[PDB]
Amino acid sequence: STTEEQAKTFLEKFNHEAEDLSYQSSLASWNYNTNITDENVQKMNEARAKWSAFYEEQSRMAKTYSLEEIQNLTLKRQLKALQHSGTSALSAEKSKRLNTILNKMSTIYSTGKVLDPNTQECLALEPGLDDIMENSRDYNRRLWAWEGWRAEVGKQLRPLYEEYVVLENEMARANNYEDYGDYWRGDYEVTGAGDYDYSRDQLMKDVERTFAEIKPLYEQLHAYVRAKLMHTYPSYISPTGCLPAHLLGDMWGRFWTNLYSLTVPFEHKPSIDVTEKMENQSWDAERIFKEAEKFFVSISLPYMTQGFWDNSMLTEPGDGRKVVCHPTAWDLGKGDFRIKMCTKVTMDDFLTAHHEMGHIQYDMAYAAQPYLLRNGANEGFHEAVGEIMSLSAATPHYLKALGLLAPDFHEDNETEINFLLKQALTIVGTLPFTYMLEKWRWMVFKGEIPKQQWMEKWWEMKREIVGVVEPLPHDETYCDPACLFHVAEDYSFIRYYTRTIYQFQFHEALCKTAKHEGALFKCDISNSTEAGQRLLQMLRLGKSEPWTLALENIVGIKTMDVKPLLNYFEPLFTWLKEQNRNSFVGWSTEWTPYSD
Amino acid sequence: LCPFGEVFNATTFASVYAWNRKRISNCVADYSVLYNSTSFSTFKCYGVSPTKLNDLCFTNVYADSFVITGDEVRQIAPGQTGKIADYNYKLPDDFTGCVIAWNSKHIDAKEGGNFNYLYRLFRKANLKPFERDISTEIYQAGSKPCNGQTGLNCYYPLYRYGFYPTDGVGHQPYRVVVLSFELLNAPATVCG
Numbered sequence: 001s002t003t004e005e006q007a008k009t010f011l012e013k014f015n016h017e018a019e020d021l022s023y024q025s026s027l028a029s030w031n032y033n034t035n036i037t038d039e040n041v042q043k044m045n046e047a048r049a050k051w052s053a054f055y056e057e058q059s060r061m062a063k064t065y066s067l068e069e070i071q072n073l074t075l076k077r078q079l080k081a082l083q084h085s086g087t088s089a090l091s092a093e094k095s096k097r098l099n100t101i102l103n104k105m106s107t108i109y110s111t112g113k114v115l116d117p118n119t120q121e122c123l124a125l126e127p128g129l130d131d132i133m134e135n136s137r138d139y140n141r142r143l144w145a146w147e148g149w150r151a152e153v154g155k156q157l158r159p160l161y162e163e164y165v166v167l168e169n170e171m172a173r174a175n176n177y178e179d180y181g182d183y184w185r186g187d188y189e190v191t192g193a194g195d196y197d198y199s200r201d202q203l204m205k206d207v208e209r210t211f212a213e214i215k216p217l218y219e220q221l222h223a224y225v226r227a228k229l230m231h232t233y234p235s236y237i238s239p240t241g242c243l244p245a246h247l248l249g250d251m252w253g254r255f256w257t258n259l260y261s262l263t264v265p266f267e268h269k270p271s272i273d274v275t276e277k278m279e280n281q282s283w284d285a286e287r288i289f290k291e292a293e294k295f296f297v298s299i300s301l302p303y304m305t306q307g308f309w310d311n312s313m314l315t316e317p318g319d320g321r322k323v324v325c326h327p328t329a330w331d332l333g334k335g336d337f338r339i340k341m342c343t344k345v346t347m348d349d350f351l352t353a354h355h356e357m358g359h360i361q362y363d364m365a366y367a368a369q370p371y372l373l374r375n376g377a378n379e380g381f382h383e384a385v386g387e388i389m390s391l392s393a394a395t396p397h398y399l400k401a402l403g404l405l406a407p408d409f410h411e412d413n414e415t416e417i418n419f420l421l422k423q424a425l426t427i428v429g430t431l432p433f434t435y436m437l438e439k440w441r442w443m444v445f446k447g448e449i450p451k452q453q454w455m456e457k458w459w460e461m462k463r464e465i466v467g468v469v470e471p472l473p474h475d476e477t478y479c480d481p482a483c484l485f486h487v488a489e490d491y492s493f494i495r496y497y498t499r500t501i502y503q504f505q506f507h508e509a510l511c512k513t514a515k516h517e518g519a520l521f522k523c524d525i526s527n528s529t530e531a532g533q534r535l536l537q538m539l540r541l542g543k544s545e546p547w548t549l550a551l552e553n554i555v556g557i558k559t560m561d562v563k564p565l566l567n568y569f570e571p572l573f574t575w576l577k578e579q580n581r582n583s584f585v586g587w588s589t590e591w592t593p594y595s596d
Numbered sequence: 597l598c599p600f601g602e603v604f605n606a607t608t609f610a611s612v613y614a615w616n617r618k619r620i621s622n623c624v625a626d627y628s629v630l631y632n633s634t635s636f637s638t639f640k641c642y643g644v645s646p647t648k649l650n651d652l653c654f655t656n657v658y659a660d661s662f663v664i665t666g667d668e669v670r671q672i673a674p675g676q677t678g679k680i681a682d683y684n685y686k687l688p689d690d691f692t693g694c695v696i697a698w699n700s701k702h703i704d705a706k707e708g709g710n711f712n713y714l715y716r717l718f719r720k721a722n723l724k725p726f727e728r729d730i731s732t733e734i735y736q737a738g739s740k741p742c743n744g745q746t747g748l749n750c751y752y753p754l755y756r757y758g759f760y761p762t763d764g765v766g767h768q769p770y771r772v773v774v775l776s777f778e779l780l781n782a783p784a785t786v787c788g
């Protein structure tokens with residue numbers, strides 16, 4: 001007698017208990033994020049504590065159920081997911097030491113502070129330093145802030161990160177993974193699916209192959225941006241060298257978005273900002289979200305539940321409380337779907353409403369799944385589904401069709417090439433940054449980097465992979481990786497690279513089924529019912545099927561392809577190729593701003 | 597007059613696993629008013645249209661009232677399967693009555709959760725028609741005895757519906773009254 005039946009009954013218990021418990025927890029989390037008081041912090045904490053204790057209970061129930069004898073794939077997947085036990089494998093002492101280290105690092109990051117020689121005032125990342133790195137054109141305050149961050153804060157995290165790698169390497173080797181990097185890569189693992197499988201190292205191989213296919217586009221973006229920044233900082237930049245890490249738009253060069261002002265190809269053509277016309281036509285938050293609803297419904301997607309319209313916070317409360325205004329899409333469960341957003345009447349918040357309501361659409365589609373499979377196929381699917389909506393909604397065709405733009409309104413390639421260049425500064429710019437960050441973390445966990453070469457490798461890989469040189473020599477007393485929110489606080493990073501590639505596979509596929517003519521960026525998916533149906537045949541899956549199968553359900557391809565990304569950017573590609581006809585493409589890795 | 601007001605307008609309904617039965621006898625019933633109330637999201641009769649059973653006489657009537665999620669209201673019908681149909685309230689294949697049902701979100705849902713209503717999640721076998729099982733014996737799923745306690749392969753057979761005034765329509769509370777009409781050799785005391 002196969003205990004499969006016992007595991008069936010156990011999962012039937014788990015679904016129904018966890019439903020109410022996670023509903024409690026999500027509701028208390030909401031009430032803190034909608035009221036934000038000490039009472040509400042306490043209620044949210046108690047709800048989450050009951051929920052987390054329920055997991056420490058039920059994961060350890062599920063450990064017994066041997067996955068091997070579960071031939072109803074769903075069951076095996078629910079049990080596998082619940083049996084991802086992580087830190088419970090470690091000794092209680094070491095679980096506590098690692099939680100101690102993680103809390104230390106996270107609070108160091110969120111509370112670190114560096115001091116002006118200027119004002120003797122001691123700034124911080126989110127207030128002062130980020131405004132410096134995003135809005136400053138002075139070479140020297142950007143260098144000051146960059147370096148002071150990596151020194152006052154990065155140095156304190158260094159031994160914490162060493163012991164962190166140590167303990168989580170043990171924590172991974174306890175769950176039969178080869179290292180913590182393999183543990184994280186265990187997200188994309190697919191097993192027991194003839195023709196649809198996916199090993200944990202094929203993520204390595206696919207990421208490397210597709211980044212190789214990305215390299216030329218990035219090299220020409222890099223040459224062009226180096227040229228413009230050399231025009232805006234001549235004595236500091238080499239025409240052939242890497243980019244000084246502190247001059248890249250934010251504290252890390254993660255996104256080059258804040259460089260657009262210096263790198264805009266056509267500096268005098270009108271940028272599409274419909275925020276003025278929305279204010280001109282007496283639109284409010286209700287109107288923005290109604291229009292997003294209409295967009296989705298045009299594509300044969302369901303309407304928002306009235307509980308959504310009754311329970312979502314779409315305006316600055318400005319009544320009796322304060323709110324964490326970070327736009328979030330909530331799936332509390334039991335058919336309750338909500339959106340937090342302190343919405344302004346702006347084109348940015350308009351597209352953001354489309355993005356968050358796309359998260360909502362993904363949630364509502366797979367609500368018929370068993371909780372444990374109520375999620376994106378893998379970690380990057382959700383945000384890609386969110387991003388393709390903003391793509392389809394920022395297009396002239398859409399903006400005209402909703403009447404937020406003139407019916408005669410056209411758009412001049414200059415305008416279009418400006419838009420593509422901005423899109424590349426944000427999207428293409430983060431791809432090598434992210435690939436190399438995660439490659440360095442992965443190798444550190446694998447052991448391929450000795451502790452005493454920890455940064456020496458990092459910056460070599462900044463010179464080699466991302467074409468970015470540090471402006472000051474850094475010894476192992478630093479830990480400039482950990483200087484990013486994600487590394488200091490233990491998050492897998494490859495999700496952004498995979499999400500980027502997924503969103504363009506998706507948007508290309510849906511624009512094909514839409515019967516879209518012309519270049520792929522302007523494609524609207526509105527009114528393309530067929531595109532929405534092709535998309536739903538993936539959304540309703542959740543993670544009940546392998547992510548290779550979920551991807552095939554949209555793009556007909558079982559794996560990750562940059563050809564849709566390259567097709568999206570081919571006009572800007574052919575633009576950079578002829579701009580750079582009097583420039584050096586690539587980078588020598590030996591030039592540094594500090595050989596003087 | 598028949599006391600349908602106390603079956604339908606009852607202040608609180610029973611949990612579906614202890615479904616309430618009221619016997620109806622020796623009274624005149626007007627069923628046309630129960631339907632033309634137009635306040636029932638479900639009023640589906642598998643015996644005869646509500647028209648003739650105002651023009652008809654039965655020996656006993658049975659009003660079975662309880663509460664179940666809207667998505668589960670499809671199970672209160674002959675020939676259906678699911679949790680509620682197998683382990684709570686079963687209608688026979690030759691069922692000759694009506695199923696009436698309305699949305700009780702304004703009554704059975706409250707902020708923070710209304711855990712008053714239960715339902716049976718596991719059972720050894722399926723119910724016969726019009727059977728009621730209200731035992732709280734821990735469901736043994738594996739082969740080790742439970743010793744009357746929840747644990748490994750050992751679960752309480754009853755779980756609580758969470759009726760919130762924010763749930764989706766299908767996870768909202770619904771009040772159901774199933775009307776059964778019988779004929780015997782005894783004279784018919786229920787007419788209209």
Ligand SMILES: *[C@@H]1O[C@H](CO)[C@@H](O[C@@H]2O[C@H](CO)[C@@H](O[C@@H]3O[C@H](CO)[C@@H](O)[C@H](O)[C@@H]3O)[C@H](O)[C@H]2NC(C)=O)[C@H](O)[C@H]1NC(C)=O
Binds near residue numbers: 298402403526527
């Ligand atoms: C695709 O879906 C969009 C959804 O927004 C449709 O947009 C608008 O759809 C209406 C109804 O078909 C079109 O008729 C217009 O109604 C307005 C109402 O103010 C009226 O002023 C116009 O003279 C016209 O009668 C409307 O043209 C259209 N919007 C625009 C900017 O064209 C769109 O029609 C759908 N595509 C179709 C049906 O091919």
Ligand SMILES: *[C@@H]1O[C@H](CO)[C@@H](O)[C@H](O)[C@H]1NC(C)=O
Binds near residue numbers: 035039040320321
């Ligand atoms: C927020 O919390 C306060 C307690 O500080 C409470 O009085 C209020 O009812 C809560 N809800 C709101 C303001 O919507």
